[PDB]
Amino acid sequence: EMEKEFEQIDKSGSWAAIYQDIRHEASDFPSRVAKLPKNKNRNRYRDVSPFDHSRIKLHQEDNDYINASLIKMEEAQRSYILTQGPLPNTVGHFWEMVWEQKSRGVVMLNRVMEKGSLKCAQYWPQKEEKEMIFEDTNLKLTLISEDIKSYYTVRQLELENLTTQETREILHFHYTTWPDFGVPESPASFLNFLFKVRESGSLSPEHGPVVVHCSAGIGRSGTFCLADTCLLLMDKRKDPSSVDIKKVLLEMRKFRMGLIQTADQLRFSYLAVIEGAKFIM
């Protein structure tokens, strides 16, 4: 059982050591499309690339590239698109991907500015009456409503395909209180946030995969998907303690590199799953 494994690693202070064995065992697949010269300004970080096998393709004939990965968890029947925070020049691509994949939710785990630098473009409207048009991808986005809480904001958005005049409602879940350094002290507000996303229907199989991002789409984004998948597997299995968080992480790392960036994120993921298991048993 993970709770005992937790106390063992904690007591022994072996978090950096567990984390290194995960790094060592992690999959390495080609990422040739990401590294083409024409895609250099579509990537926020030169060392964070989607694998060719799992990358999301835009349906535009010119250049189909976006820094985004499909993570397919077969046993849990959950899919996620993990992506970087969009760049000034990829905001239109981001919304095209949301449209093309039939996503119902966007989960944002960073602030636009952290540590005095921009981590992400302002890719949604700030006021009802000031909508955004993306000329490159022929989409219009309107803020319908905004519910600001202590730890997170939920926004209702309308996305319109200007080409066909179809509209969809998108939910934007913005976790606003992840600290600039390290991880939250308690997983309570993170779990509350994750149950809010679940309750919305955004993670359900009747929609396209949820789009999850932080700045790189690997650290905080990683923790989100890992916690959701582990809790779902504990509901589904005859024996809940058969769920090994290290094995789940390694399976997720076949689809996108670097998921969980620090030993502290790993520790936090264990704590989130262990605490969430109480609200599920």
Ligand SMILES: CS(=O)(=O)N1C[C@H](O)[C@H]2C[C@@H]1CC[C@H]2O
């Ligand atoms: C020494 S350790 O690897 O067990 N250790 C745990 C501690 O909480 C600090 C610093 C370091 C790794 C991450 C961070 O959580």
